[PDB]
Design an enzyme around this catalytic site. Structure first.
Site, PDB file in Angstrom:
ATOM      1  N   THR A 114      -3.089  -0.283   6.376  1.00  0.00           N
ATOM      2  CA  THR A 114      -2.697   0.163   5.045  1.00  0.00           C
ATOM      3  C   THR A 114      -3.165  -0.915   4.049  1.00  0.00           C
ATOM      4  O   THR A 114      -3.863  -1.854   4.453  1.00  0.00           O
ATOM      5  CB  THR A 114      -1.171   0.460   4.979  1.00  0.00           C
ATOM      6  N   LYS A 164      -7.979  -1.960   3.974  1.00  0.00           N
ATOM      7  CA  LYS A 164      -8.762  -0.804   4.410  1.00  0.00           C
ATOM      8  C   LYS A 164     -10.285  -0.992   4.264  1.00  0.00           C
ATOM      9  O   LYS A 164     -11.075  -0.351   4.972  1.00  0.00           O
ATOM     10  CB  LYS A 164      -8.294   0.482   3.698  1.00  0.00           C
ATOM     11  N   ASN A 201      -8.490   3.520   7.389  1.00  0.00           N
ATOM     12  CA  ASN A 201      -7.072   3.244   7.647  1.00  0.00           C
ATOM     13  C   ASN A 201      -6.752   3.221   9.143  1.00  0.00           C
ATOM     14  O   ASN A 201      -5.589   3.167   9.537  1.00  0.00           O
ATOM     15  CB  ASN A 201      -6.170   4.274   6.950  1.00  0.00           C
ATOM     16  N   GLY A 260      -7.668   3.389  -4.222  1.00  0.00           N
ATOM     17  CA  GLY A 260      -6.605   3.693  -3.275  1.00  0.00           C
ATOM     18  C   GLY A 260      -6.951   4.904  -2.415  1.00  0.00           C
ATOM     19  O   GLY A 260      -8.040   4.956  -1.835  1.00  0.00           O
ATOM     20  N   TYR A 285       6.190   7.825  -2.058  1.00  0.00           N
ATOM     21  CA  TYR A 285       7.366   8.383  -1.374  1.00  0.00           C
ATOM     22  C   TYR A 285       8.622   7.499  -1.420  1.00  0.00           C
ATOM     23  O   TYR A 285       9.700   7.913  -0.978  1.00  0.00           O
ATOM     24  CB  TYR A 285       7.035   8.794   0.071  1.00  0.00           C
TER      25      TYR A 285
END
Length: 264
Positions: free
Chosen positions: A61, A65, A86, A123, A211
């Protein structure tokens, strides 16, 4: 007994072990371990290079990456396409890099067509573009702060057959962009998206990569309007399936991992 884990910085709150270990349990791989490893970009080669033979692979993560893609001696076409990895999988002579964040977006959405909106230029944004293209989206608008990185993402969209354009955030084009799109994938921080929540609220479907904490202001706005809301947990679930398969050689146990995600 084999070993896997997740490399990142920070890493303490990773929910990857919950998913992977639920999977290994369901597969009868009770003796396997999956550990959270504090690891930055420069440190990635030190850690992976030091892995003993029982290591089958690791999840990677932020912020490793790009280093993960470079460290591998073999890279999947899709990892190459998005420009980062990843996933690292041990092979007889070395390491193979893949990027399952593409699966994370495409699987979390299930289906999509026509016009899509992507927030962010880096990202998981490249994975989202590829994942959207994969589902058959034909038009993508990239809304981002960094106009230079956004142009690179626009070219990637073009190269996977998608009519792709840049729209600056405060250029007065955002409402028009939302009105034309059926799905929004947000890869930017909740703190940045929050101020635009009122404009973005009308989107029929939101996939928010964030999240934790939950809900984001954007998610609350879309949910309030009745749009379909998909949390970052679904991306995590769907990107984990392919990693489990590459680490174990067995099919992802989707029901067991889905039960573990519900608990999350």
């Amino acid at each position: 007994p084999k070993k896997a884990g997740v490399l990142g910085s920070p890493i303490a709150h990773s929910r990857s072990p919950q998913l992977h270990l639920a999977a290994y349990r369901a597969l009868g791989l009770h003796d396997w371990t999956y550990e959270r490893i504090e690891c930055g970009a420069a440190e990635l080669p030190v850690v992976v290079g030091g892995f003993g033979p029982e290591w089958v692979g690791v999840s990677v993560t932020m912020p490793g990456k790009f280093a993960a893609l470079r460290f591998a001696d073999e890279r999947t076409a899709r990892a190459d396409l998005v420009g980062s990895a990843n996933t690292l999988v041990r092979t007889p002579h070395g390491w193979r890099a893949d990027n399952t964040d593409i699966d994370g977006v495409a699987g979390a959405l299930g289906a999509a067509a026509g016009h899509a909106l992507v927030l962010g230029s880096g990202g998981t944004a490249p994975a989202a573009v590829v994942g959207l293209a994969e589902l058959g989206v034909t038009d993508i608008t990239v809304v981002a702060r960094n106009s230079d990185k956004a142009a690179r993402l626009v070219d990637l969209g073009t190269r996977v057959g998608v009519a792709t354009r840049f729209c600056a955030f405060d250029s007065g084009g955002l409402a028009d962009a939302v009105a034309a799109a059926e799905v929004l994938v947000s890869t930017i921080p909740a703190e940045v998206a929050a101020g635009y929540a009122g404009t973005l609220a009308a989107i029929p479907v939101l996939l928010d990569a964030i999240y934790d904490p939950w809900p984001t202001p954007l998610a609350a706005a879309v949910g309030s309007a009745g749009g379909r809301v998909i949390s970052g947990l679904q991306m995590l679930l769907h990107q984990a399936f392919a990693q489990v398969e590459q680490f174990t050689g067995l099919p992802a146990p989707r029901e067991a991992m889905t039960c573990a995600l519900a608990a999350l």
